[PDB]
Symmetry: D2
Subunit: 489 residues, 4 copies
């Protein structure tokens, strides 16, 4: 009701969907309906694929430096419109304005800026075999690719997916999460306004079980880049494989361990622990939700965490002084409380929070308190399963190697981190920790240069860094024969 009805974006403009259906997006801070949003039909998918196939030909036909200049213009527009977009993202996600205006668009554009600079650097190889033959490889665009977004960092994800895709000369059809479809459409406008050819970046809104599914099954789409839950991830990846043997990137969930070594500065450890659990109200996939503390440090560490949790400024996300907002959706809140209850039921020691915040106004949003459990065990549900809400589990150990083994003891493998002042501990531990994203004495920083993604069931492929650009191309090997050809027949 707050906004005009949102339409699909195809061929450098808004078009009417052909399903007759809509859905609504809700501000989770107050329950207000933000907008009616159209549902893409199976035929709308077809339209967007045809648009993308054509746009990609125009885009790939431009020179590298031409793509580079256009993507830079988009970066520039993103910089200037940083605050408008953050405000929109705060409305849609409930995340504090303090975060969206300094992180979401900022780090999204950083990656686009990075890749824009790298377009002329994409190169194949040359390999001499003998005087009369040699080989060269070509890195060619995949063609049409599809991105599927999650709801925790809507625009950032769109950017981190579309940037390398477009830089490598592909077209992307992007499906934002049903929960957070607003910023994705703005991004499509900005691309068009920067000079990105019609059809190169199209946005389809709708549900994953339909639109997402249809993108995953389409025989003309070459690759799917997905970000979401491990369970969904497996279904998306399977449908992508069985339909037409597509390429896949999977950025999934985790239960990332944070190991505080017994020599650690507990102030730093505590700051890290709280950042690794309560930023974006605990809705970051790389969150360090299993915190290992050595028995000699438990009491002091718990106190230091407690002092920090107590000063967390939960509040209205539109207030600049807020640094902890509501969760993204009332149903997701219900799921987090469900997990919190299991922690209580399973005799984990509640250190703080554990409840919904219902006091005046807060009752109108989906606010869960920053919750900390301690004296947890490896068989607890809060320790084994991804919660995706502000729930830290503090776990005690006595042997550093035991801590590592337990850290590794999971089907997840997204992130890991250690806090220590010791050279040998830092590097030796990090080397044995089975995860794709590893932090020493810090947490959460994810530079454009740094390739990120999960080990095991936390992912397939990577985002950011040089490697990701390469994986939005396909290798063609060309053997040139300059001498004679011999047949056995």
């Amino acid at each position: 009701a707050r906004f005009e009805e949102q339409k699909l974006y195809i061929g450098g403009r808004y078009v009417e969907a052909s399903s007759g259906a809509t859905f609504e997006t809700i501000n989770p801070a107050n329950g207000e309906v933000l907008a009616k949003v159209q549902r893409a039909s199976r035929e709308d998918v077809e339209r967007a694929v045809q648009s993308a196939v054509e746009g990609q030909k125009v885009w790939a036909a431009m020179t590298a430096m031409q793509r580079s200049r256009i993507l830079r213009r988009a970066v520039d527009i993103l910089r200037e419109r940083n605050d408008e977009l953050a405000a929109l993202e705060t409305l849609d996600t409930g995340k504090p304005l303090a975060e969206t205006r300094s992180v979401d668009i900022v780090t999204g554009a950083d990656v686009l800026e990075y890749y824009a600079g790298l377009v002329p650097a994409i190169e194949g190889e040359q390999i001499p075999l003998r005087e009369t033959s040699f080989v060269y490889t070509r890195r060619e665009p995949l063609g049409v690719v599809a991105g599927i977004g999650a709801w925790n960092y809507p625009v950032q994800i769109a950017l981190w997916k579309s940037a390398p895709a477009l830089a490598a000369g592909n077209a992307m059809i992007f499906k934002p999460s049903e929960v957070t479809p607003l910023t994705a459409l703005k991004l499509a406008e900005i691309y068009t306004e920067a000079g990105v050819p019609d059809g190169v970046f199209n946005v389809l809104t709708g549900s994953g079980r339909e639109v997402g599914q249809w993108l995953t099954e389409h025989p003309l789409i070459e690759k799917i880049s997905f970000t979401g839950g491990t369970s969904t991830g497996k279904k998306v990846m399977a449908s992508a494989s069985s339909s037409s043997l597509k390429e896949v990137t999977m950025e999934l969930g985790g239960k990332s361990p944070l190991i505080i070594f017994p020599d650690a500065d507990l102030d730093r450890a505590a700051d890290i622990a709280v950042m690794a659990n309560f930023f974006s109200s605990g809705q970051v996939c790389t969150n360090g939700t299993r915190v290992f503390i050595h028995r000699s440090q438990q009491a002091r560490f718990e106190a230091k965490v407690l002092e920090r949790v107590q000063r967390i400024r939960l509040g209205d996300p539109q207030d600049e002084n807020t640094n902890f907002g509501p969760l993204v959706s009332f149903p997701h809140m219900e799921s987090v409380l469900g997990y919190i209850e299991s922690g209580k039921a399973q005799k984990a020691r509640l250190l703080c929070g554990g409840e919904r915040v219902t006091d005046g106004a807060f009752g109108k949003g989906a606010y869960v308190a920053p919750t900390v459990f301690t004296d947890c065990r490896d068989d607890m549900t809060i320790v084994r399963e991804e919660i995706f809400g502000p729930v830290m589990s503090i776990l005690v150990y006595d042997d550093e190697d035991e801590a590592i083994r337990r850290a590794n003891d999971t089907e997840y493998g997204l992130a890991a981190g250690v806090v220590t002042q010791d050279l040998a501990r830092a590097h030796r531990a990090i080397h044995r920790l089975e995860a794709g994203i590893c932090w020493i004495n810090t947490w959460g920083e994810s530079p454009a240069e740094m390739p990120v993604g999960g080990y095991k069931q936390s992912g397939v492929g990577r985002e950011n860094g040089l490697t990701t650009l390469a994986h939005y191309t396909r290798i063609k090997s060309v053997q040139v024969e300059l001498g004679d050809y011999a047949s056995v027949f």
Copy 2:
């Protein structure tokens, strides 16, 4: 009956399976039963996984140069045992001794030799962010991986899969094709005898719908490398994804185009065409089974092909003078004849062959004649579908761009090739042809340095070359923070 009963190979030795079942492998040249072969049970898979998990730890703990030296020793043994292995491969596949002793083991060991030299070259990156922080990446072994083989080049495939896997410090459990399980077991012996730790290369025999399936579903196996039909490929890839989100390499089938440009030397074109269709009795996946000839050259080209087909020495594969043997299996022969019949039924012009060779002795094997159809059309079944037997389809064109468009007009994309003496034609055509493996004025050569694999539904990932070694590792990003950490809380 010819050989002892074949057992599983686990932990550097032969072990009894626990299914109680066996199957038989047949020499397709004479129908003789070569050997009873044990069927791996679900519990045998578990045993091989546990063996592999342990072996991989020993192997990965050795230095790079230590792995290098051992893999070189294996190469050396492969060189010395080249003729024994070829003879065995000829018995199992029906492929001429002329091919197995100069190609199969030779090119298999070449790739192992290549990768052996490259072990100390595997490196991560280093990226400075600022005076107080930097990033380094590590390329770490995947751990336990599984190879699944096809029956056309049994030992070569095992080698091309296991070489980069082992070089990157992984363990591989290999499942050869039911049709051709013999050489894979020999390879396992040779690895052990070269100094490869127990469990690093294990072989399970059995059927794909069982053992293959169980490997694909296992939660402790990190990656599946598969080589086989596109249809099977899609099922394997989906099961690999849905079970535990494994990494995948898919080397699948194709309907690769060969375009003869109107300036081409027709002698060379004909030699290429016949090599690209009748080597290994037409059972090569990269076969150029759709041959485009310009209307001005059709008559002369057909004659030149005919002169070459007529001198093909079909015969007993154990005779050195044979250069065209039977197909791999009587059922596969029945399938090829089925396709041949459809070509006749659909009014394609039979140029030669088209029948089973039943004359004295040949009636005891599964021999199909080298078959050539001409005046074919893009909607014919022999033109649209992979036959995997000695069946060439000659197709006529008038516009070079039309030829390219038609070459591209398929869901396949494994290989492509052009014959021309013109600089501009060669490179411009090859650039527009949608395939991973592209030949100019030659066919079938696949050097260790050259990464090979399909576009579209012909594959995911690559084999051979530097890139393949890298993809048997996983990237870990490590960010080292050397300065202060700032918390918003």
Copy 3:
């Protein structure tokens, strides 16, 4: 003088030289003094180094993307000021405005734009040795470097040297040729205006015998990048070497061969030959001044060359219709006339030109007519020596291997090119030619991505491409021991 006296540029501004000496730059089109120019003293060099050492620390302390953004801003300014700069360069060099407006600044800025995007891509390696030790490398700035320019492409050369230097975090002190000091001072203003810190790009004017010598001798300068004559190159490289063991880049002269094969399009061949000899009035280092024609093509090719030479618009370089200006200076003209005279004396056949152009206004300038000699012999002075003027030598050959051996029979090795339609001959010929810069069926194009430089006495090191960026850093290996250290004592 047309312009005010030109001062040194040190620390983000113009400053007075302390030599009390000047020289003048003259317009070679009319003999007018463009400007008095100050000569740097030793003290001024010392000042420039101090300024550079301080600038470099500030520049290096910024982040990659900060440097990137600043260089991009410089690109924008160069794009805007393209015409002003072109006009100034035309005054200083005598090159036609039609060239300077479309080549010099455009391609200079192109290279800067390329490197600006690459700054965040500069990466070290990481190598695992064993569980308790690993290595990582850093690519660190060299520090302070010096670029010494040539007079034929003054601003372009300043840009191709300073771009990777600055992109890699260095400061550069640049000394333009005393013949063309004007545009380098403009570039320095532009860098400063773009946000490049004071001291990072300083310009010293003066002679090679003084200022240039002092730069190569200075113990605080880490690298000299030099473009100019081979003889001078040797002296510069020896002084850089023996003084303090500096790294060096040398882009020197050539006598590059152009081989026209009997299957060449002769219209393309003649276009290529003329472009390869008469662009910038033949003052391009990579010029194909030895043109090999097959005997069967001689008459026809000479006629085609003559048709093109006759329609060359020799004239006032400020007239937009001019495409052939005077030479850069009167003494250079005289040197070229001497060579021309030598050609007549040694009985080459003059096909056209061979004389100074003196009619009307031309006598006030340094105009040499486009000159073609034919029936040349390998022992002729005009065939052995770099003339650096508009003088083509046509050499007849009978077979292809003979042409190649003759092409290679020189101490030079800057560029080479072949003209042919045959696929095999193009690549095979090019692989045998001993030159760093090779063109097939074209000439002169030098994309930012393509490493360019000389073989043999034509060069050391490269410019442009990824490699050049790397060669403006130095490698530091860091070995981290995480385990025990064993002493033998």
Copy 4:
């Protein structure tokens, strides 16, 4: 003489010099003449170049894997002959058999083994410009190169220079130090015995003033790789430069700092310091001859050094129990004694040694006792100059930035190292140290994978690692024009 007269090695065999001049090599342990050695004449150099030019063509014409196999065979032979070679090297250099048996040949062969595996990995780039033009690069051999060796690690240095040279398809003419010519001649026999073509590795004996000079001046040699003193390095590099513009590699001397931070394990620190000063009797270029100790640690650290020095087994290098031999020659000894005398004169505090060892057999040798000076000052001769003998200078510091600035305050920059347990200090310190070879908590280890070389006046270029292999090729860019060529004329 112990051995027969040593001849030149040219073209796969020994040949007579044409100088009619000889010199002798002497065992520095007893003063005995080991052998007469022929001096190469200019004609002999000319012969060696001709032989090399022809060998290189044969070598380069083989395939990568053929070269690889041949170098591997050389590795095997070196492994077998390790003890014979060690014993010979001990005779020529005076280094303890315990070092030569376990370091010199082992690590020399290690590097050869590394590069042998890398030959097939040498690759060019391919860059697409537009649909009608692309670029590929070739990495071509340099051709004939020369290596000039030093006397402290004769065979190792011959191996580290020749390995990448030969791996990249070059021929190398090697001139060992006149002080230690014996093992280089052995290596040449071994290469030939392994299947290296005649002329590919030739050895010339003689002096630097003659033979070495003639090699740097020769117009057909493409590159000089030099290891030795900085002063000589400058002369060599200037002669290589000014003669014919050769590429150069310089591995020069140093005054490398070892910084012991207040949080260091002092037992490790003392072990590191002693190893960094007294291994090979202190005749290692990367030696940490400036040892920085914090004031609070001074007394304790000196005592720990003294305990280790006192148990050094100075003795007959042929005794396996010896771990500290004499210096390489009597004049080198005298130079070291002069430096020691200078240290006493300038009032450094002698902690131990400081004298020639003359008792019994020792007087027949060039034995200098392990010497430690302490309370040194930055302006002392022993602190500023490379002594290249067993002389440690201990320098006290008060804060960490002071130590680093003082470490950096030198024209040298070969190696640096820090000892500390702190994570942040280790990396931060190392990043500020101006040296090409940096060790954290260790010293002296130089893996084949790790690029080693000097900053500043300690070096130009690198040895070992991937980069060094690349720097033994030259880059040729090839631009293929597939479309029209436009001329302005």
